[PDB]
Structure formats: C-alpha cells, structure tokens
Amino acid sequence: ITVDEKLDITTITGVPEEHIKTRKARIFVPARNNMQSGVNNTKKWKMEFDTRERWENPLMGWASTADPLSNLVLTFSTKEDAVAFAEKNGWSYDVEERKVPKPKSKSYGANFSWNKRTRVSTK
Amino acid sequence: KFIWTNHKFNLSGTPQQYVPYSTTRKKIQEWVPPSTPY
Amino acid sequence: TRPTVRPRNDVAHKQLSAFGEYVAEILPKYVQQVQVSCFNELEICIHPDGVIPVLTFLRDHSNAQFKSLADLTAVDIPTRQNRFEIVYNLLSLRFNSRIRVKTYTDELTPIESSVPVYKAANWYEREIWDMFGVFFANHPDLRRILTDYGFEGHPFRKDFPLSGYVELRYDDEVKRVVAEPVELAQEFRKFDLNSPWEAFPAYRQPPE
Amino acid sequence: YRKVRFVGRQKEVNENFAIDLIAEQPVSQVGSRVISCDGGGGALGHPRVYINLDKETKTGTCGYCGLQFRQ
Amino acid sequence: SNLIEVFVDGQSVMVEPGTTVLQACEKVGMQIPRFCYHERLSVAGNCRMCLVEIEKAPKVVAACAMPVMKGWNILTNSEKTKKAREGVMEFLLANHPLDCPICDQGGECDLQDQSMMFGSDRSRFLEGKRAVEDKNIGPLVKTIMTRCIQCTRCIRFASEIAGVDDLGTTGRGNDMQVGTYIEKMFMSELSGNIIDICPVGALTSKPYAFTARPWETRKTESIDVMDAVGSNIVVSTRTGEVMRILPRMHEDINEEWISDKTRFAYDGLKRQRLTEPMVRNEKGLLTHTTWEDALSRVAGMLQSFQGNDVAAIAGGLVDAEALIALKDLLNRVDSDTLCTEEVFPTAGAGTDLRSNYLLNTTIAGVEEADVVLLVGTNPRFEAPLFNARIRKSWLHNDLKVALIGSPVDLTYRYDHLGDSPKILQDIASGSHPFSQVLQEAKKPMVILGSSALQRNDGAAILAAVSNIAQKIRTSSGVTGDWKVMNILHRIASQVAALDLGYKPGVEAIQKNPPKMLFLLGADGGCITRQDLPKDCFIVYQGHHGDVGAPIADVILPGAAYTEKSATYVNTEGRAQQTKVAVTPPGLAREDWKIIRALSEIAGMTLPYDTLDQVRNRLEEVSPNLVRYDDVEGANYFQQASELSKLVNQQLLADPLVPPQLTIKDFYMTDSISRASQTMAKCVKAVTE
Amino acid sequence: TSVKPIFSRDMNEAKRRVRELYRAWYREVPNTVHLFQLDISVKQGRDKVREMFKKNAHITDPRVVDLLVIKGKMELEETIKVWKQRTHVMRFFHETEAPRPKDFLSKFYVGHDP
Amino acid sequence: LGLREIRIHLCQRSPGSQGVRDFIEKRYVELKKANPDLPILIRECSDVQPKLWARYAFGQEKNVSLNNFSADQVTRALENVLSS
Amino acid sequence: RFRGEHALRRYPSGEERCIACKLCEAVCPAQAITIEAEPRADGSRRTTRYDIDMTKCIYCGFCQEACPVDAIVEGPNFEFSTETHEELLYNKEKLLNNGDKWEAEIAANIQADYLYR
Ligand code: SF4
Ligand code: SF4
Ligand code: SF4
Ligand code: SF4
Ligand code: FES
Ligand SMILES: [Zn+2]
C-alpha cells in the first residue's frame, strides 16, 4: 500500500535553463485560412510561443537565429486540459476564446418578393 | 549556343575561387535626413 | 474490392477474437480493456499494478507461452491527464501470434520493472529512463545510455525543442572543448501541410 | 563594406543573360484562334496549355514558354 | 416546440422547420462539398456539387437550397451520392488550363482540396480546353478569367454588400464570360476584398502577386490600426518580413470582410523609415549618432525646465502602453499641459464617464434598430465596415435612414434632409419632416460623426443633438432602455488615449508658448514652429519621417504596429492587444522602454520595468483596459445631459461638409498611407 | 494523492537522505582535482557544491525531492570513477561565456528585450 | 499640486457597491456644479472594494476604500480630500 | 541515371527553364534549396536568389523528379573537392555556368532515360 495522501501543487524545475520566467505562452484556437473554405483546421486548442529577433546571416541572407523554442505547436483537446499543462511545467499564459458563428436564417426562395426589398437579378 | 569555349576547372585558389555572395535588393531602405539648409 | 487492395481473412480474425476473450475472463483484477486490431493483432489494456503478474501469467502456461519479448517502447501524449504510454510486445513461438500490453502511467508514479520476468528488458528500460524520465522501480543497474553526460531534458518528449540548448564548439582560449548557447545559421523553416475537408469519415470524432 | 570577399578572387559571375533574350525570336504567326505550345519538343518542356491569340494580336509566352508567341 | 426531428445517417437531430439539408448536416459535424454557396451571400444552385442521396427516393437533390420536411433519412455516404460527386467534378476539371506551377492559389484552391479527397482519379477528355482571354479591372486585382469555374460567387458579391452593380453574366451556353462588358474600371472601398471570395485562381492579388506559396508563412494573429473600428487580421511572415494580410472573421466586427485600405498598406511599413537616433548638427543638418550620446542630451534639459514650459502632443497610432510612461513622466514633474492631435469640444463633460463618447449601441445592435438618423458625417470613407453593416441591415428587414448635410454617394436610398446647422435646432421642435418618426420609433439611433464635431461650433452641436436624444428617451423612451446617443471616430488611438485621462483638443498649448515639446502626434500640422515661439528645441519620437521629423531637434525611433505587443481600443471600449510579428529593424526600439531609460538616466525612476507591471499600472487607472472584448452596460448620462446644458453656445452658418472627395481622399490619409507607394500608384489611376 | 512514493514517506527520510550524499560530494571534491590533472584551487570545487544545493529549496512536496536524489545519486558513479574525460566536469564552470548584463540600462543598449 | 483630480471606481453589480450608484444620482450634478476646474474621473469595474484614488503632490497616490457606505457617507467622505 | 553535381538547363535559345514554382524546395528532405522569387519586369515570373548547399545535399533525386518544367537536373560529373566551406554554398549564377559547361553531356542522358519515368 503506502499511498500517503496529501495535497501539494505539482511544479517541476531543472529541465530548461532560464526560459521559465522570460516567456509567456499563448493558447489559441486557429481560425480558417480564408482563401479556402474547409473547417478541419479548427477543433484543436493549440499553444504557441513568442517570436524574437531574426537577423541576417551576412554571407547569404539566411534568417539565422537564437531563440531555441521558436517552433513548437502542441495540440490539446480542450480548454480544461489546456491550462493544465502550463502550470505543471510552470510558465505563464494567456487564453483566447472559441468563436462559433450565427446559426443562422437563410432561405432560397426569399430572393423573390412582392413588396419586400430582397430581390436579386443578373443571375 | 550558350556552350563554353573549351572547358574550365574547379580551381581552389587560382586566385579565382568564385567566393559566393548574395543576390537580392536591400529590404527596408532607411530614410535619409533633409539637407544642410533649413 | 478490386486488385491493389489487401485481401483479408476471417480465420485469424475469429481465432484471435476467440483466444484473448478469456484473458479478461480469468484475470479480471488487472485487465480493463481488450480490443482486436483490424489487421489481426491484439491489444490489451492493463492497469499499472498488473505490470508483473499478467506478464507472469503469460511467461509460462500451456495455452499461451509468449516467450519472446520483441519490443518494449514508450510514447508520450500530452492531453491525456496521465502522460505516457508504455507498450509491451510479445511473441508466441509455439503458436505464431502477437499480443501487445498497453499500460498507462505518469511521470512521478513509478512502474515495477519487468527485469526478473524477462532478462531481455535490462537495456530496454535503462533507455526509456534517459529518453522520457520514467522511473522503473528496483532496477538492478540504472544508468545513462544514448545521451551525453550533460543533457537534462529527456529529449524524445514534446517539450524538448528539436535542436538542443548546448551547441558545442572548440576554442584555443585554453585547450578545452567548450559549450555555448545554441546558435543556428538557418531558421529551420516550419512548413504547414495539414489541409482541411476531413477526408476520413469512418474515424470521425463525436460531434459535440 | 561587403566587397572585400573577392579581393583577388576574380568574382565569377554570369556572362550571358536571359533577362531579355526573348526578343530575338521571330515571333510566330498562325492565323487561327487557339494554339498549343508544349514548347521544346514532346514529352519534355512545359505542359500543354491553350492560349487565346485575339487582341490585335499576341498570346503572352504561355506563362511558361517564354518565347514570344502571336498571330 | 417548433422543430422537426430529422435523422441524419440514421441518427436523430432536431432542426427548425425551415433550415437546409446543408446546415442540418453541418450540425452533426459533416461538410458536404461546397462551391456555389458562401454564408454571407445569397444562395444559388448553379454548380450542383452537394448531391445528397435522400433515402427512399429515386432522384438526387441539392442540399444547398431545399427545406427539410418531416423527418427524412439524410443518407450522406451511399453508393449513389459517391457516383454523383465523382461525376460532377470531372466535368469542370475538363475545360480548364493545366496550371499550378504559376497560378497563385497553389496552396488552397478548391479544385485541389476536393480532388484528392472527393472526386475522380484520372482524366478522359482528351483534347479540347477552350481558352477565353483576360482583361483589366484595376491596379489591385490581377484578373485571369481563363480559370473561371463560373460559380457566380463574385457577381452576387457586387449586387450584395459592395453595392456597385458592375459585374454581370454575359453570354449563352459554354460561351460566357464574367467580367465587365465595357472597359469600365471597378473600384470603391471593399474592392480588393473579392480576392478572398474567388474560390479558384482567377481573381488574385496584384502587389503580392508572385512572391511566396502559402505553406511557408507563419500566421500570427494581430489587430490593425488605421481606422475607427480597428480590425481582426492575421499577418503572414516568410523570413521576418510581412508578405500579405487577411481577415480573421470575428463575428461582430469584420463579419468576414476587411477594408481595402487596411489590406494594401503593408508596403508603408518598410519603405521610408527612420532607424537610429540623430544629433542636432547646428544648421539645417541632422546627422546620426551612437545611442549613448542623445540620451542625457535631452535629459539634461529636463532638470532645467519646470512648470508649464514643457509639453507633449500625441494623437496618431501609438498604443495605450506608451501613453502611460508619458503621463507619469510629465506629471511626476507636475507639468501636464498635454493633449491629443484630435479636436474634441468639452462643454460639461468629456473626460468623465464620457456619456456618449463611445458608440453606445454596439455594432451588433445596429441590426436591431428601426429608424437610424445620422448627421454631420460621410460614413462611407471612415469606418467602411460599419457602413457595410448598414447596407446589410437596410436589406433583410426594413430600415429608414435620413442624413443631414452635403449630398454624397451612399449606396442605399437615403434622403438628404437638410444642409445647415439650423436643421438641428429646428428638429428639437416639430417641423421639416420625419419630424416625429424619431418620436414614433421603437429602437432609435442618432449618430453624430466626428467630422462635424471638430469644428468651431462643436459645443453647440454636442448639446443640440443631446437635447433630441433626451427628447426621445424621456417620451417612453424606446420600450425599454435602448441607449440612443452615440459617436464614431476616424483616429484609432483616441478613445484609448482620452480615457486614460487626457484633455481633448489642442487649446492649452494654443494659448501659451512652452519651450520644449515632444511630438508623438505628429504628422498633422496643427502645430508648426511658426505657431511656436523661436528656435527652442522640440524632440520627436516616431517611426516615419514625413512631416515634423525634418523640423526637429533630436529624433528617436519607434516600432510601428506589427512590432510590439500593445493595446488599442475601438469605438466600443473593447481592448484588442496586437502581437509581435517582426522585431524592429536597425537601432529602433519599442516606444515605452525608451521612456524609462529617459527617466532612469534623469532623476525620477518609475516603479515598473516589465510589460506585466505596465498593465497593472493600467489596471490602477482604468480597470476596463484588461477586460478584453467586452461591452459593459453603463450609460449614466441623464445626469450628464442636463449638466451639458450649462454651455449656451449657438450655431454657425456653414454647410456640414466632410473632407472626403469622390474617392481620392480615402487613400492618402494617416502616415502609413502616405509612404506606401501602392496607394501612390492607385491614386493616379483614379484621376485618369 | 494516490500514488506510491519512490524511497521516502514524508519530509523526514527525504531530508536526511539529501544530507547523506552531501557528505559524499564534500569528500569527493579534492580527489578529482588531481584524478583528472586539473589545475585550480581546491576551494573553488567546494564552493560550487554548496552553491548547488541551496538552489532547490522552494519545494513543498515529497517524491519531487526524491527525484533530485536519483540524479544526485547517479553522478557519483561517473565522477568518482573515470568516465568523464576532463571536459564534462569543467562545463559547470562557465569560463568562456561572456557576462550577461542583468541590469536594465545595459540591456537597453544591446539586445531587443532578452 | 494638490490637487489635480480623483478617480471614482465602482462595479456595475455585486450590490455592495450601491452607495456610489445613489451618489451619482444625488451628488454628481450637485457635486460637479461646484468645482468647474477639477476633472474627476469615473471608471468601470474593480468588482470588489470600490476604491477611490486621489492623485496630487508630484504624482502621489491616496486611495480610500469605500466598500459599502450609505448614500450620505459617500456624500461626506469626498470633502475629506476636496477641502484639503 | 547517375547522381552528382547540380545544374539548371535552359530552352533553345535561352529562357532559363526554371519558373520558380516552389516544389524542388518542398521535397528536399534536408532543406537545402532556398528560393526567393519576384515578378520580373517583363511579366513572366522567375527567381532572384537560388541557393543549394552542397553539404546538406543528401543526394536524393527528389528535386530531379518533382519539377514539372523539367529544369533542375542532377548532372553526371563527380568533379568536386574544393578547399573552403565558404565555397560549397551555391548561388544561382554558379549553377547556370555549371549547367552550361555541358548540355551535350546531360541531354544525351535524359533522352535515353525519360521513357521509363
Ligand atoms: S471570378 Fe471566377 S471563380 Fe470567382 S465567381 Fe467569377 S467565374 Fe467564379
Ligand atoms: S485554380 Fe485550381 S485548377 Fe487552376 S491552377 Fe489553381 S488549383 Fe489548379
Ligand atoms: S526547377 Fe521546377 S521546382 Fe525548381 S524552381 Fe524551377 S520550376 Fe520550381
Ligand atoms: S538531391 Fe535531394 S536533398 Fe539534395 S538538393 Fe536535390 S532534392 Fe534536395
Ligand atoms: S453545391 Fe453549391 S449549388 Fe448545390
Ligand atoms: Zn510554350
């Protein structure tokens, strides 16, 4: 047995170096690259970090850099388990919101009226 | 057409060693101050 | 359906259905989910207290030998509320069959090591310690394999960014070969390839 | 500031240019409506695209072909 | 109550009596392939690419436009649906050129993200492919109408929201084109917004045109500041440089639409820019300097002057974080005397609870109004997306709109009521018709614009319209509360600036001659050195050098709007934090951190260093600058309206004229408009 | 907290275990200074150890302290023997790396907000 | 100086703040009829402890915390600072 | 079908057969290619910078087969061995020179072997 019940907040340290207090994370819902119309790109809460300098490598023009995180997207399933990872490793954050549209009221056949204003042509 | 004359070589420093460079225009083109008169 | 589509058979799809039916019937203290893979393989979910006995039941028996440990591996999964995933894999040499043992876990909760049951998993368990940080209990020799003497990241997990922190170099400032902060000469471009329209209707998630 | 890397290195650069070597082509004429240009020979060169040649009268070098094409 | 239980794929779902098969199947999480149907448009049936096999029926119907009767079995995946989608989308991919090496929608186009997933596997034509010719429309929209799946989606745009009826359908059978029959150019506001609508590579961008394919960009969301409502964009960096920006489809502002100026003005970010601190040299010379020369230079003069001989003006596009480090530096030395560039008259209130200074009916309440009256403004070329919301709400239900002053071109049938300030005074009484329809209104809306209030009679027209806003609300008023009196703007960082506790209108500096000024206004010439006293210095802090940076003592660089995490506030008190895209080039720095290193090299040192400590200093002064995107219910202006009756200024004799031209004033306005040469290249194509 | 511990139970066997291995490292500073032929002063090697244990004293929980033990227990394999060829030990002493400013005004001249 | 202005914070609801919601009804139009110099500010929502800032003497803060007064205590606790 | 030094062909009388369609850079497994196009003044689009490292080049043959307009070709000459790392970075205007030192070599190869692929 020896199950030793208590309560203490799980915070871990030692594994990164100094980027705990310097960088605030960011959790967002990605929203539909609008040149197309497919909505599979939504439905996953992600997180993503800050952007820092990108100078020029003065022999070609390669945008070389420090900032070793810079390419990390994780895919979390929900808000409830979103913030439950920024605390267990212990860095700050800021939370966006999910936006779902108007339900809405559309009806073909309402484009032809007797006294109303919605009446389309040129089709 | 567009063929070379006889041949060439891969000469490590001949003195010519091709010394690669960048092939773009500069990006931001910083603004210069106005002239010496006021 | 046509050529260039894999033909299945219902023989092994019925036998491996029927066989591992009674591995949940005769040890219902540990086994908490069994599902049959469509390509004639078996998965069996086991609570981490049953790490030693359900191997030990398998290890010697008349009906299920499974005497070869092919592959011990480990997968990490954020958003699961219990991170990792330990996956055992065995081989019935008398019977030509496969079964996988999928035991979930966490970081701080230890796992009783399978050193005494199989002596194949001596090196398969020192390794996983280095790559994720799972602390296998009472291991006879736990050490540092496949990493340098200075890594403190356990790099095969999702929190370690791809290039490290410790990009190395030489200098003549004394004689030594010394570390540095990481310094790339190219960005490592991150392309975006995940295209919409949800092409797979069978595996579709519930709507919510 | 930058030009010191080729001191005594002869700075090997291109000699011919195709920035405009289009213009020496005797721009082809047909007297039709739409023409194919899989230019450069079959099973090589750019894919076949059909251009409308009716302005007063040019095509537009196919987008791929480069060679000035017209009626 | 009032629903039909309809079974999709053998699974129940409850929909209203009058929805579509499209929306109902989109409720349980499925996307039928769409071409001829966008949500914010009307509905047509002219591509036939949603073909659901409805169960227990011989025929196949379109799920775009039909009702849903008593509970069907909407059977999506069958063996008759999948023989139709595969058969329709072999037709249109026949008469089509063989691009995708060079066509610019090579990353997203929906003849390509259908045709792996749905649709066929190989081609059988095997020769043909008719080829129509292109033309020009404007210097914004490259137009290759060879590609053209003829879905009639761009044409229903023009007859809808952007009310210029210019495009058409010309021909019969296979022989038809889309573009304008005469050689007329098609240009207005929202004119470049069609290149998102166009589902294949026909309409594509002119300045972006051939630079980069869209699987390489790094999308980071951000908010744009060139206008009143702000925006909702997403920038797209390639290698540390902005390539193009898009809309982001917030549901209340930018429903899916973006403004044309806000789309094509990223060039002004990177053309004509100042990068380094510069020293005086005593003549009209002005030369660059190392960073530790010109810090204690200006900080020497702070210890000398005291009292109201030092001031600052700031009225452009700087945030609400580099407007706190200014206010706590000039008022710890106790010399406030500072104002914004914009002129706003105060009579009884204006800095305190502001009472109408934010737009009280929000944008989402505009669709609920019934009689909208608006005075003193040309709403078309300032906040255009608010104008498009009127255009939507004028359609789809009834609305009655009247305007006072300067007959201009609005796309919906208004009526020019009158053109004088004296129309306001008479409409407080009952005369000159509509006369009581505001009294006979159920949800009124009376907008004052900020174009007329800048004038010299601003304290009169502020109190005049507040009287008739009192007159309606004291009658019933609406049902109901329904806040009435409201205002919009045309400068982005004013509501952010003014509700920190500044004064409005440059009058305090307009009377006295203080010695040193700090310019963050600045390019509007409401103060010149001639209106100033003699050659005593002014120190300039900005990022562009158009007007005011040549006439300056020491200039300091700053980061513009894509380089710093900031805060901006539109006309409803929302707070929309822009985020980092590029780090600022050269020796430029962020604005609010050059102020602390001006402070700490001088005497007073401010008690905050990091950005989180800045926003707690914000939360001290105004607690609603961390309540992001929320509109609270607080009006409190029955007390303000009687207290604003204190000033008794009268009207004037001048027609309430807006500055805006036919279009041409729309392009070149702020600062980034000016340096961006594509605005300079689309302005001479208007005049010709 | 329903999970078995590693070695300790609650706050007492742990905070005598961490005091045990400190007496190992205090003994095994002046051995490696000649076992690798490295020429510094011996008091430098003792300063780094008493620096290192004070770093982690913000813990209010068992089996996190026990996790740091296992790392601290492991290093005495390599360090007391000869498995690090003079170079993996000397990385704790950042001799090459330039000093960081760590004060506000010196960051502002050089570097875009580190 | 002192002084320059003050900052009346409140909350829209959580009705322990209800003294200011009557104080605006009683003494704002009577309050700001006096002192046509001092631009006292009203802001939105502290949501708890509806404080009242004062700012004067080279930018120094003085913050009383009226949590739940009457309509008459807020009538008289303002001229603690307004007189001084 | 041998793999080796790189080249960029061009049409009969020259057109610089490349069209900057950005595929030879998206299936390099090693991310060697670095293309930055621009609308050239005549209207047809071309490259400005084109960069192939000869050290990250893992020698697939994935550039050779992804190209629609049949331009970039792994040319059949293993002549190499320069003395500086500053040199093996290739520009655009090396490859053309290196691709017009021969085309009698390359076009004899591709005509033999395009019939299979
Ligand atoms: S521009 Fe082309 S794709 Fe767009 S609606 Fe017109 S024909 Fe269809
Ligand atoms: S519009 Fe469609 S068919 Fe034309 S090039 Fe683009 S993806 Fe190909
Ligand atoms: S060779 Fe082909 S893939 Fe490479 S740049 Fe040219 S067109 Fe693009
Ligand atoms: S050979 Fe392969 S790795 Fe090398 S440049 Fe070509 S595609 Fe890239
Ligand atoms: S699919 Fe668009 S019309 Fe039915
Ligand atoms: Zn051609």
How many whole angstroms from E147 Cα to the centroid of ligand 5? 19
Q: Whose CA is nearest to atom 6 of ligand 3?
A: H18
- The full DSSP string for E468-490 is HHHHHHTTT-SSS----EEE--S
In this complex, the residue of E100, E106, E209 whose CB is nearest that of residue H39 is E209
* C202/E680 Cα distance (integer angstroms): 54
CB hemisphere CA count around G78 (13 angstroms): 20
DSSP string, E180-224: -SS-----STT-TTHHHH-SSSSEEESSSSSS--TTS-EEEEE--
Q: What residues of chain F lie within 8 A of the CB of C150, using their CB?
A: 88, 91
DSSP F40-83: S-HHHHHHHHHHHGGGGTT--STTTHHHHHHHHHHHHHHHHTT-
* Residue in H closest to B6 by C-alpha: H101
Q: Do chains F and D touch (3 or more CB pairs under 8 A)?
A: no
State the nearest Cα–Cα gap between B24 and chain E, in angstroms. Answer: 13
Count of other CB atoms within 10 angstroms of residue H46: 20
Resolution in A: 3.8
Contact between residue E4 and residue E70 where contact means Cβ atoms under 8 Å apart: yes
Which residue pairs from D43-47 have beta carbons closer than 8 angstroms and sit at least 24 positions apart in sequence?
D43/H114, D44/H70, D44/H110, D44/H114, D45/H11, D45/H69, D45/H70, D46/E101, D46/H19, D46/H68, D46/H69, D46/H70, D47/E98, D47/H68
Residue D25 to chain H, least CA–CA distance (Å): 8
Say which residue the tokens 């966008």 belong to.
Answer: E38
H52 Cβ inside 6 Å of ligand 4: yes
Whether D18 contacts D62, CB under 8 Å: no
Q: What angle do CA E612, E613, E619 make, to 5 degrees?
A: 90
Domains of chain H are: 5-116 (3.30.70.3270)
The residue assigned the tokens 């225009």 is B25
Structure tokens at F32: 């490696």
Atom from ligand 3 closest to the CA of residue H71: 1
Distance in angstroms between the alpha carbons of the first and the last residue of chain E:
62
Q: Output DSSP code: residue E366.
A: G
Q: Positive or negative CA dihedral for E608, E614, E618, E619? A: negative
E682 carries a ligand binding annotation: no
Distance CA D39, CA D66 (A): 9
Tell the burial category of E561 from Cβ atoms under 10 Å away from its Cβ (0-12, 13-18, 19+).
buried
Q: Whose CA is nearest to atom 2 of ligand 1?
A: E148
Structure tokens at A69: 């995180």
- Would you say the C-alpha torsion E607, E610, E614, E615 has a positive or negative sign? negative
Nearest ligand to the CA of H63 is: 4
Strand ranges inside H1-117, DSSP E: 34-39, 45-53, 89-90
Residue D9 amino acid letter = R
CA H46/CA H52 separation, integer angstroms = 17
Assess whether the C-beta atom of E147 lies below 6 angstroms from ligand 2: yes
Helical segments of E280-417, H only: 294-304, 327-330, 384-394
* Residue D52: φ, ψ to 5°: -85, 120
DSSP A34: T
* Structure tokens given for E536: 């005593």
Show Cβ contacts of residue F77 under 8 Å, excluding neighbours closer than 6 positions. C143, F83
Asked whether the bond before E418 is cis by omega within 30 degrees of 0, the reply is no
List all chains that touch chain C, counting a touch as 3 or more CB pairs closer than 8 Å. A, E, F, H
Are B19 and D6 a contacting pair at CB < 8 A?
Answer: yes
Q: How does strand H45-53 pair with strand H89-90?
A: antiparallel
Nearest to F2 among A3, A8, A13 (CB): A3
State which approach was used to obtain the coordinates: cryo-EM
CB contact under 8 A, F88 and C149: yes
Residue H69 · residue D38 · CB < 8 Å: no
Both tokens of residue A86? Answer: 């920024």
Distance of alpha carbon E172 from alpha carbon A74, whole angstroms: 53
Q: How far apart are CA E531 and CA E431, in angstroms?
A: 45
Show the CA angle centred on residue H31, arms to residues H27 and H35, nearest 5°.
85
Cα angle G55, G56, G59; round to 5: 80
Residues of H in contact with B1 (CB under 8 A): 12-14
C-alpha closest to that of E573 among E419, E267, E354: E354
Mutate to test the pocket of ligand 2, among E93, E95, E98, E105 (most ligand atoms within 8 A of CB): E105
> Which H or E run contains E510?
helix E508-511
- Distance, CA H5 to ligand 4 centroid (Å)? 11
B29 near E CB under 8 A: yes
C-alpha gyration radius of chain B: 21
Interface check H26 vs C, CB under 8 A? yes
Q: Give CA separation, A111 vs A117, A123, E256, in Å.
A: 9, 11, 22
Write out the two tokens for A10: 């799980």
- Give counts: helices (H), strands (E), chain B: 0, 0
Q: Which residues does ligand 1 sit against, CB inside 6 Å?
A: E 148-154, 178, 198-200, 202-203
Report domain extents, chain F: 1-114
> If you take atom 6 of ligand 4, which residue's CA is the nearest one?
H63
Spacing, Cα E144 to ligand 1 middle (Å): 10
| Whole-angstrom distance, CA of residue E359 vs CA of residue E643 | 20
**What spacing in Å lies between the alpha carbon of H62 and ligand 4's midpoint?**
6
Residue nearest ligand 4's atom 8 by CA: H28
How far, in Å, are D39, H17, H47 from residue H44 at the CA level? 16, 12, 10
Q: What is the DSSP string of E376-408?
A: S--TTSSSHHHHHHHHHHHSSS--EEEEESS--
Q: Would the annotation count E47 as a binding residue?
A: yes
E640 vs E637: CA distance, rounded Å: 4
Q: Inspect the interface and report whether the beta carbons of H91 and B12 lie closer than 8 Å.
A: no
Binding site annotation covers E103? yes
CA torsion, ordered F10, F16, F18, F20, to nearest 10 deg: -150
| Per-position b or e across E302-334, b if 16+ CB within 10 A of its CB | beeeeeeebbbbbbbbbbbbbbbbbbbbbbebe
Q: How remote is the C-alpha of E40 from its chain's centroid?
A: 18
- Find the angle CA(C101)-CA(C106)-CA(C107) to the nearest 5 degrees: 125
User: Rounded to an integer, what distance in angstroms lies between the CA atom of residue F11 and that of residue F20?
Assistant: 15
Amino acid at E387: N
| Residue E686 φ then ψ, to 5° | -75, -45
E144 three-class SS: coil
Q: Which two tokens stand for residue C181?
A: 């902060």
Amino acid sitting at position F13: E
**What token pair was written down for A16?**
């990164």
Question: Atom 2 (ligand 3): residue with closest C-alpha?
Answer: H67
β-pair type (E246-247, E278-279): unpaired
The CA distance from A109 to D24, in Å, is 60
| Contact between residue C115 and residue C139 where contact means Cβ atoms under 8 Å apart | yes
Q: Which one-letter DSSP state was computed for residue E314? A: -
Burial E401-421 (b: 16+ CB within 10 A, else e): bbbbbbebebbeebeebbbbb
The per-type count for chain E, helices as H runs and strands as E runs, is 17, 23
Length of chain D (residues):
71
| Cα C176 from chain centroid (whole Å) | 39
Count Cα atoms within 13 angstroms, Cβ side, for E217.
20
Atom from ligand 1 closest to the CA of residue E199: 3
Which residues, listed in sequence order, are joined to residue C97 by a DSSP beta bridge? C92
Residues 6+ positions from A10 with CB-CB distance below 8 Å: A87, A88, C108, F61, F64
In the reported structure, the alpha carbon of residue D28 is separated from the centroid of ligand 6 by a whole-number distance in angstroms of: 12
AA identity, residue B23: T
